[PDB]
Amino acid sequence: TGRDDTKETVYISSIALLKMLKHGRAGVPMEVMGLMLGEFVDDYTVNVVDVFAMPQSGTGVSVEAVDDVFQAKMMDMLKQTGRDQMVVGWYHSHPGFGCWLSSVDVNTQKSFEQLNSRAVAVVVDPIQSVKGKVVIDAFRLIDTGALINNLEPRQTTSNTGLLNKANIQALIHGLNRHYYSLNIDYHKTAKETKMLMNLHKEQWQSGLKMYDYEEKEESNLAATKSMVKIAEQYSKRIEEEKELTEEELKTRYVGRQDPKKHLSETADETLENNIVSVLTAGVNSVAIK
Amino acid sequence: EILVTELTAQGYDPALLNILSGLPTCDYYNTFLLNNKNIDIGLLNKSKSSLDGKFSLFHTAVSVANGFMHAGTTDNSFIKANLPWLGKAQNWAKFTATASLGVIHKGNLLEGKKVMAPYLPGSRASSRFIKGGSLYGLGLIYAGFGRDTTDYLKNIIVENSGTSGDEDVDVLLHGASLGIGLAAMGSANIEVYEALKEVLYNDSATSGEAAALGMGLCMLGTGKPEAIHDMFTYSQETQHGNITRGLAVGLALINYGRQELADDLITKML
Amino acid sequence: MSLQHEKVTIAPLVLLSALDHYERTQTKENKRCVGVILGDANSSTIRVTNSFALPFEEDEKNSDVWFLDHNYIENMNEMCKKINAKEKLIGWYHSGPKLRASDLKINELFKKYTQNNPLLLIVDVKQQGVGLPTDAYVAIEQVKDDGTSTEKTFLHLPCTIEAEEAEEIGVEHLLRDVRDQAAGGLSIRLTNQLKSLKGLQSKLKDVVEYLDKVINKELPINHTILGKLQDVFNLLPNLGTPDDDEIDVENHDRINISNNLQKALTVKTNDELMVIYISNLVRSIIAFDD
């Protein structure tokens, strides 16, 4: 038998993820890059412990814009701090385009694949990470010959995975003609969770701190008026709401957005807002003196 | 197992103690299946046409599926129907096809070694997968019946438990550890517990998870406190996700029927 | 050096990175990871974007004896420009649970390379604090008017965070918690309301026992602390003020809005009560017909 290649999932430590985002957005739209320091263990886990950035160029990515001289100095800096392991590949950030390897990027990747076969290329989209999703996808070159022999099915053996394809168009061209994409899981520790979830010093300063009570009166005025308009609209609707076919009523007597529903959202927000506010006043007034 | 030792000293006929082994009783089940099994061989062809063999995921579905459909009596129809089609596959798709033979030929104790014989390590060397997947398929054959089989599978494990292990070795060692698990299922072999503990401590890619499952099967129901803690701890020790999953569920096997004596581990696992 | 400061803003990356570097020097038990701190300053708000390890040895016998590898710091800074040419020394982090008095002597060494007084950012690795797991100091030298000599001392500044939007969503992506210490619905802010009051208790306890410690165990009578304490009382209400009577009138106002809002919700659900009855009413006929 030969060597069989099979699924992997690239686990981007919490550290690694922030650095790529920080370095990549900051340098966008000029292309950003850097090496991924980490370790491969297992046969299903690429674990990227850290990344750093290699110096930007206005030739963007190139095979000779990788720059090994800078790589070597950087490696010795990690060596003296006892953090060097194994460079597990390279990442680069396309600006506002999708995750797909460019033709040039294929040859950049071909170089790192010689040095370690388990090397990945991680393509980042930073201007698209300001949604509620962070858009990052991973690729790893597969032998052109292997694709001829139908060895893309080989890469999904021994699990159902979480297989899904987040992007096509240039992606599915490059997969077909070069690569096997990887899904992305995140590693983080229980320490790191607590660091991430904590984002305020005002955690204990937000139910003793209050907003000006003129602002609250303005808010109650605004809220009550809004629901007064929605009630007139509702009242026009509910003069009927009694004939056959719901859908006919929704058109005819506007139940376009349902003024019942609309009033419920508005009612509930200001009602909940006032209970906190009164409770803050009453805590401070009685407790402090 | 404790009951037969007593009946011998109460004084009983050896006919009865043959039954209590279950080897006669398995054969009676074999017969019933030999005669009446109604299987669609044309359905197997239509699926064969639709699901390609060089397409590895597709090949697995079929091997498994037909293995269940023909399960119970040794049927060589699957092999002959799909005779070029099997060889097209490799990697774990070819691993499954070998071990699927033991689903089809499940039971068949008399012929147990014999039918799986050309796929045995030391009579096959073409692939690492076939060599491992026979041991697993041999384990299904003696699943619940492998009192003899325990030693034969264990020889291979102890030979391979001194290795640091190769990826060639891992595929052989993996099927050994699943197979011996079934063979030694609920027989409380501490020999097997020890043997597979050393495999887990090799830290091998596929074999550590396969060893973890095998211990839980053998030592089903015992609730041994050494085994419970050692495996609970090892999940942090290992750095492979496969291996981590295998330990967690192997503790399940061990706390079978132990209800609230097992409460304590559950609380910790959650 | 900037002698003007107000706040310290911290990027999330900084905290996490010092915890990573800490475990990979394998430091514990008064051997504490110390690396350089990188970011923007000449700004009252110290904005810390990044941090990196230095080769550092801490002796546990004496912490006044330490090793710092000065040569490395210049080389590393040239590679910081490669990443981004707007990162410079603005201090150094400590990884320990709290402030040491050997930290004042350490701070001296980073003055040489900073255009700003050097920052001490304590990145805890046990993640204590009821706000952020970071304390912040900057070293200031001043005359003390209490009849004691000129000190260099670490004076506290607030801690805040400035997070890039790009990075922040990574925090949300990573985090699978639905958040109970940050705003949400009524119940969520009801916890936030109780949480703040319980935070005040803990903070209020520490002052009382500090005051006991001063006049029996003889800790310095520090006028600057106690002056802010005098202003706590002067800014503290007194019962029988027409301002605190207006609070009663203002309570009536928002509660009444809740009272009408509560009625409004009750009306709307009674429309759905009747709807469902009309749905049952039709479905009697359909059942009977079958």
PDB file of N, CA and C in Angstrom, chain B residues 24 32 74 103 106 108 117 140 157 169 173 179 186 196 224 226 253 255 258 261:
ATOM      1  N   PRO B  24     -22.929 -25.154  20.938  1.00  0.00           N
ATOM      2  CA  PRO B  24     -24.072 -25.823  20.267  1.00  0.00           C
ATOM      3  C   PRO B  24     -25.201 -24.879  19.918  1.00  0.00           C
ATOM      4  N   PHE B  32     -30.864 -22.179  11.079  1.00  0.00           N
ATOM      5  CA  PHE B  32     -32.085 -21.450  10.786  1.00  0.00           C
ATOM      6  C   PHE B  32     -31.807 -20.381   9.742  1.00  0.00           C
ATOM      7  N   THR B  74     -22.603 -17.973   6.311  1.00  0.00           N
ATOM      8  CA  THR B  74     -21.475 -17.666   5.448  1.00  0.00           C
ATOM      9  C   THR B  74     -21.936 -17.752   4.001  1.00  0.00           C
ATOM     10  N   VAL B 103     -19.431  -9.939   9.265  1.00  0.00           N
ATOM     11  CA  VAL B 103     -20.828  -9.620   9.520  1.00  0.00           C
ATOM     12  C   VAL B 103     -21.686 -10.648   8.802  1.00  0.00           C
ATOM     13  N   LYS B 106     -21.059 -14.018  10.395  1.00  0.00           N
ATOM     14  CA  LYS B 106     -21.266 -13.941  11.845  1.00  0.00           C
ATOM     15  C   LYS B 106     -21.951 -15.185  12.378  1.00  0.00           C
ATOM     16  N   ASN B 108     -21.035 -19.100  12.852  1.00  0.00           N
ATOM     17  CA  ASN B 108     -20.185 -20.002  12.044  1.00  0.00           C
ATOM     18  C   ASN B 108     -18.846 -20.270  12.740  1.00  0.00           C
ATOM     19  N   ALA B 117      -9.490 -17.127   6.883  1.00  0.00           N
ATOM     20  CA  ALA B 117      -8.096 -17.548   6.838  1.00  0.00           C
ATOM     21  C   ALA B 117      -7.232 -16.831   5.797  1.00  0.00           C
ATOM     22  N   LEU B 140     -16.008 -10.434  15.430  1.00  0.00           N
ATOM     23  CA  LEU B 140     -17.461 -10.513  15.296  1.00  0.00           C
ATOM     24  C   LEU B 140     -17.918 -11.952  15.266  1.00  0.00           C
ATOM     25  N   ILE B 157      -1.268  -8.572  19.853  1.00  0.00           N
ATOM     26  CA  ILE B 157      -1.278  -7.311  20.584  1.00  0.00           C
ATOM     27  C   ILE B 157      -0.010  -7.171  21.412  1.00  0.00           C
ATOM     28  N   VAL B 169       1.768  -0.604  11.205  1.00  0.00           N
ATOM     29  CA  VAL B 169       1.407  -1.368  12.387  1.00  0.00           C
ATOM     30  C   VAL B 169       0.063  -0.904  12.926  1.00  0.00           C
ATOM     31  N   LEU B 173      -2.936  -3.256  14.414  1.00  0.00           N
ATOM     32  CA  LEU B 173      -3.103  -3.206  15.863  1.00  0.00           C
ATOM     33  C   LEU B 173      -4.484  -2.717  16.255  1.00  0.00           C
ATOM     34  N   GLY B 179     -11.275  -6.397  17.953  1.00  0.00           N
ATOM     35  CA  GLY B 179     -11.629  -7.793  17.852  1.00  0.00           C
ATOM     36  C   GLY B 179     -11.553  -8.483  19.197  1.00  0.00           C
ATOM     37  N   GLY B 186     -17.231  -9.485  28.312  1.00  0.00           N
ATOM     38  CA  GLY B 186     -17.768  -9.905  29.583  1.00  0.00           C
ATOM     39  C   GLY B 186     -17.198 -11.211  30.051  1.00  0.00           C
ATOM     40  N   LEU B 196      -4.137  -4.097  26.553  1.00  0.00           N
ATOM     41  CA  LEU B 196      -4.636  -2.940  25.832  1.00  0.00           C
ATOM     42  C   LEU B 196      -4.288  -1.627  26.523  1.00  0.00           C
ATOM     43  N   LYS B 224     -14.620  -1.700  37.888  1.00  0.00           N
ATOM     44  CA  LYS B 224     -13.322  -1.715  38.517  1.00  0.00           C
ATOM     45  C   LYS B 224     -12.838  -0.292  38.760  1.00  0.00           C
ATOM     46  N   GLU B 226      -9.861   0.917  39.508  1.00  0.00           N
ATOM     47  CA  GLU B 226      -8.599   1.227  38.834  1.00  0.00           C
ATOM     48  C   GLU B 226      -8.852   1.618  37.388  1.00  0.00           C
ATOM     49  N   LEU B 253     -19.211   1.503  29.063  1.00  0.00           N
ATOM     50  CA  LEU B 253     -19.341   0.064  28.991  1.00  0.00           C
ATOM     51  C   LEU B 253     -19.093  -0.547  30.347  1.00  0.00           C
ATOM     52  N   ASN B 255     -19.474   0.785  33.406  1.00  0.00           N
ATOM     53  CA  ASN B 255     -20.515   1.052  34.390  1.00  0.00           C
ATOM     54  C   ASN B 255     -21.870   0.545  33.924  1.00  0.00           C
ATOM     55  N   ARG B 258     -24.949  -0.623  36.741  1.00  0.00           N
ATOM     56  CA  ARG B 258     -24.396  -0.256  38.040  1.00  0.00           C
ATOM     57  C   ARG B 258     -25.138   0.932  38.654  1.00  0.00           C
ATOM     58  N   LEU B 261     -24.473   3.406  41.702  1.00  0.00           N
ATOM     59  CA  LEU B 261     -23.123   3.161  42.131  1.00  0.00           C
ATOM     60  C   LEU B 261     -22.198   3.803  41.150  1.00  0.00           C
TER      61      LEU B 261
END
